[PDB]
Swiss-Prot record:
Glycyl lysine isopeptide (Lys-Gly) (interchain with G-Cter in SUMO2) crosslink site(s): K30
Tissue expression from the record: Abundantly expressed in the heart, skeletal muscle and kidney. Expressed at lower level other tissues.
Gene name of the record: SYF2
Name used for this protein in its record: Pre-mRNA-splicing factor SYF2
Quaternary structure, from the entry: Identified in the spliceosome C complex. Interacts with CCNDBP1.
Range covered out of full length: 114 to 227 of 243
RNA sequence: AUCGCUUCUCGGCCUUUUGGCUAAGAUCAAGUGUAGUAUCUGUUUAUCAGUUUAAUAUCUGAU
């Protein structure tokens, strides 16, 4: 059995959050060594190109593949859509604001003047 | 313990949100007494007796 934890911190740079998300997505993927070997026995030495070494024009993908990336796109898009968790419209406390822009400005002022 | 779904709670974003300047740009606010106008609003009580009138009505009188 296995165990780990990862706590959230400051967004410090957009890079940090991006990196966390990449970690998760990367861990998810599971590759088929079948297709890997199939692709391998055709091309051989072309498999291991340096930045500058080797070249074959284009690798054309079966559509079924393309569907995988499209699906992952939609998933990540949703997960990103949920970035900001909204606090429910609570009327219970005292109202001094005149509109929602004013309500939010009063909230930002509450953070900076204690 | 792990995975997923749902419910509530909390933290983080919340710049995504206070058009620029000058001589704070400059200045300041009084009253319903009289009438009338206009608009809505309401209308064109029950007999009978008389007075009256072209006829109504009015007037008078009990309801």
């Amino acid at each position: 059995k296995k165990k780990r934890k990862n706590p959230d911190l400051g967004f410090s740079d957009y890079a940090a959050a991006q990196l966390r998300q990449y970690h998760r997505l990367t861990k998810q993927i599971k590759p088929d060594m079948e297709t890997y070997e199939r692709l391998r026995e055709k091309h051989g030495e072309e498999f291991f190109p340096t930045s500058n070494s080797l070249l074959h024009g284009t690798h054309v993908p079966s559509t079924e593949e393309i569907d995988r990336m499209v699906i992952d796109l939609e998933k990540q898009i949703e997960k990103r859509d949920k970035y900001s968790r909204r606090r429910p419209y609570n009327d219970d406390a005292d109202i001094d604001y005149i509109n929602e822009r004013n309500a939010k400005f009063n909230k930002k002022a509450e953070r900076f003047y204690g």
